[PDB]
């Protein structure tokens, strides 16, 4: 069994700027490309299953939980429910100038517990392979680092691949998330052809990914910096309590001020 | 003692610890274990014993005197639980320094 | 070196990547327990969030 | 409570005659070693 979760960075600031920029690629066509991927993923195998989540600066919403047009109800209903659910998010959304960073950690969290719920509801007669495809486009936030790291290790622990399909802004932690989880990361230069990357690079699952040739992952710069200056450094002094990278020795660590002794 | 001869040279910031999976309640010893226990306390080596089908005196005193814990396998789930619990970092004792 | 984190074979110093440290920060940020509500308690959210 | 982030631990296991005993369902030596492989991996996975 294969479970594919698609995460769309539906941030209205970036996509709105692109609309104001008269960008060729747009969120609608992006959601439509996601729709084709979701359909084609399920279309690939009877046991294939999927979920879709979109994120907004305020919150994230799930897009997925007769034959009047002569076609299968599941595909047709999946298309309609996804369109209706995305429109509800876009229409039912507040406006706030102070908050613009896109939510990602909360979206991945819901996906992981959803996958875990599915991992329990699935019959033990069959094994379920799960993957998360993150479609990032707008800027990340430093506050998300801690929470994003939590979900990254949970996904690794629970063997979920994080596949990153970046549109514009390249999050250093996102390119780390895939590498830590063994997922792929790519930034598309030709946003209008995003669907080709999805079907060629992101469509194949781990079993297919192994038996196939794909561009090697981009080198990941695992930067490290002291919490006092946030400057990249090769040597940092941590403590067995705060475990925080300090710039230099101090009798008291500013985050805790515990009574360290000179040495 | 073999562990102590190794853990004694370890730095002070690192939590030195030993996990003992005790199976046969009888154990031969070349010297009084109480001296070694006192040495373990002084060496700040955290010792915790897990006894299988046995509730041994030396393991009881060794653990509780050193500050560690001595537990015995109730069943497979208890064994799984005890090892899972030991994966947690040790809570810092009032005698422990940073 | 091919594998991290590891202690220096020469300097006797620990080499590690920043995510490995964050892997322990859950110990520093213990999660607060959620209050139990086994009864429905008229919660209109039929679906678990 | 404060927690010791970095820790060095030695696992002591008996190799005595009682390890061959089928004290649990599987052979005690097999059971303990099999579960220790899990514990060893989890030890690094959490620290």
């Amino acid at each position: 069994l294969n479970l594919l979760v698609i995460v769309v960075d539906a941030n209205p600031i970036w996509w709105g700027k692109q609309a104001l920029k008269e960008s060729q690629f747009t969120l609608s066509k992006c959601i439509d490309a996601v729709m084709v991927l979701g359909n084609s993923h399920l279309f690939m195998n009877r046991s294939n299953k999927l979920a879709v989540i979109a994120s907004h600066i305020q919150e994230s919403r799930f897009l997925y939980p007769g034959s009047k047009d002569g076609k299968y109800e599941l595909l047709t209903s999946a298309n309609e429910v996804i369109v209706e659910e995305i429109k509800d998010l876009m229409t039912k959304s507040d406006i706030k100038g102070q908050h613009t960073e896109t939510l990602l950690a909360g979206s991945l969290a819901k996906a992981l517990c959803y996958i875990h719920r599915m991992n329990k509801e699935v019959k033990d007669n069959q094994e379920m392979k799960s993957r998360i495809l993150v479609i990032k486009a707008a800027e990340d936030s430093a506050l998300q680092y801690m929470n994003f790291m939590n979900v990254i290790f949970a996904a690794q622990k629970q063997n979920i691949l994080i596949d990153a399909c970046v549109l514009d802004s390249d999050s250093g932690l996102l390119q780390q998330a895939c590498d830590i989880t063994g997922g792929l990361y790519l930034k598309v230069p030709q946003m209008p052809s995003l669907l080709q990357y999805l079907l060629w690079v992101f469509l194949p699952d781990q079993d297919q990914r192994s038996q196939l040739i794909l561009p090697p992952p981009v080198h990941v710069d695992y930067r490290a910096a002291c919490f006092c200056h946030r400057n990249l450094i090769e040597i940092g002094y941590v403590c067995s309590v705060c475990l925080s990278i300090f710039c230099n020795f101090s009798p008291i660590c500013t985050t805790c001020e515990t009574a360290f002794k000179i040495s | 003692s073999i562990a102590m001869q190794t853990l004694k040279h370890m730095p002070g910031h690192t939590s030195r610890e030993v996990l003992i999976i005790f199976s046969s309640l009888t154990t031969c010893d070349p010297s009084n274990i109480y001296d070694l226990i006192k040495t373990l306390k002084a060496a700040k080596i955290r010792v915790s014993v897990i006894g299988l089908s046995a509730e041994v005196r030396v393991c009881t005193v060794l653990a509780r005197e050193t500050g560690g814990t001595y537990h015995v396998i109730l069943d497979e789930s208890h064994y799984k639980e005890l090892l899972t619990h030991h994966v947690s970092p040790p809570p810092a004792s009032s005698s422990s320094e940073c | 070196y091919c594998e991290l984190p590891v202690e220096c074979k020469i300097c006797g110093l620990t080499l590690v990547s920043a995510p490995h440290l964050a892997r322990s920060y859950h110990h520093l940020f213990p999660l607060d327990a959620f209050q139990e509500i086994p009864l429905e308690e008229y919660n209109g959210e039929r679906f678990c969030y | 409570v404060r927690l010791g982030m970095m820790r060095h631990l030695y696992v002591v296991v008996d190799g005595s005659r009682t390890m061959e005993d089928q004290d649990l369902k599987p052979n005690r030596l097999t059971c303990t070693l099999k579960l220790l492989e899990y514990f060893v991996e989890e030890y690094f996975d959490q620290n």
């Binding site: 790291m149 919490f227 | - | 920043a18 | 409570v1």
Partner: peptide
């Protein structure tokens, strides 16, 4: 020894470094 903290927000970022009409 209970857990103590003075500036915990710094942990949220780690090494990570740092129009209204639009």
């Amino acid at each position: 020894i209970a857990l103590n903290l003075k500036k915990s927000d710094r942990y949220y970022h780690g090494p990570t470094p740092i129009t209204s009409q639009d």
